[PDB]
Write a protein that binds this ligand. Sequence first.
Ligand SMILES: [Cl-]
Ligand SMILES: [Cl-]
Ligand SMILES: [Cl-]
Ligand SMILES: [Tb+3]
Length: 129
Amino acid sequence: KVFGRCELAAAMKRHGLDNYRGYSLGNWVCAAKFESNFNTQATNRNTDGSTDYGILQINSRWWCNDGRTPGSRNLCNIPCSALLSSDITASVNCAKKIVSDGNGMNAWVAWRNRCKGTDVQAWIRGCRL
Ligand SMILES: [Cl-]
Ligand SMILES: [Cl-]
Ligand SMILES: [Cl-]
Ligand SMILES: [Tb+3]
């Protein structure tokens, strides 16, 4: 599923991401924009053999099991395929675990390089929320 901007903001808000670990909704929508272009089916293979999955490009090295990332962990206790669903629940629950680690949203390279420090509220501007 390719969400619309305001559609994703509303789904994230319902799933409790808004102000989760002090990160306003605009930060999450901005991160999704640059990680996946709002596409739940987005996948990207990394140089180390791990793969990033879903709207927030969550990595198999630590967070989900895909069966082909040797020596990896599955800290969200899910198959990586669950992160590709039209239903964003698994991606949101897993993102909450990631952002609770010591690095916050800097875990998302696109957020650090393209959202961090910007007017992230522009990403939820005009949305009925
Ligand atoms: Cl594996
Ligand atoms: Cl699994
Ligand atoms: Cl933080
Ligand atoms: Tb850690």
